[PDB]
Amino acid sequence: EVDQQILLQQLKSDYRQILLSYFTTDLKEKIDKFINAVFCANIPVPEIIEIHMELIDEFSKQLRLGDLMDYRLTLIDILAHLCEAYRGAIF
């Protein structure tokens, strides 16, 4: 187990699956698990935002088309859940 990239790549993989199933019908568990992992690893929000953008770039290439602006809903949903995880813990 070399370093941080081991987890950051797994998280990117997990987030990819959330994006691809976001506008479908079960998803809740995938999001809850992703949130708990970034929460437990103290991953900064800018890193999550970077994963989002990277996957958007990958998607745009696979689709032969960087804001896929509808996926901003997904990011909002993720950040809102992360905020609440942290807020529910502070006190």
UniProtKB/Swiss-Prot annotation:
Top-rank taxon: Bacteria
Gene3D superfamilies for this protein: KaiA/RbsU domain
GO process terms (BP): circadian rhythm
Keywords: Biological rhythms
Pfam families, A to Z: KaiA
Domain KaiA C-terminal residue range list: 1-91
Function: Key component of the KaiABC oscillator complex, which constitutes the main circadian regulator in cyanobacteria. Complex composition changes during the circadian cycle to control KaiC phosphorylation. KaiA stimulates KaiC autophosphorylation, while KaiB sequesters KaiA, leading to KaiC autodephosphorylation. KaiA binding to the KaiC CII domain during the subjective day yields KaiA(2-4):KaiC(6) complexes which stimulate KaiC autophosphorylation.
Family: Belongs to the KaiA family.
Note from the entry: Lacks the N-terminal pseudoreceiver domain (PsR) domain found in some cyanobacteria (also called KaiA N-terminal domain).
Subunit field text: Homodimer. The KaiABC complex composition changes during the circadian cycle to control KaiC phosphorylation. Complexes KaiC(6), KaiA(2-4):KaiC(6), KaiB(6):KaiC(6) and KaiC(6):KaiB(6):KaiA(12) are among the most important forms, many form cooperatively. KaiA and CikA bind to the same region of the KaiB(fs) form and therefore compete.
Comment block on domains: The KaiA C-terminal domain mediates interaction with KaiC, homodimerization, and is responsible for the clock oscillation function.
Stated name of the protein: Circadian clock oscillator protein KaiA
Organism listed in the record: Nostoc sp. (strain PCC 7120 / SAG 25.82 / UTEX 2576)
Encoding gene per record: kaiA
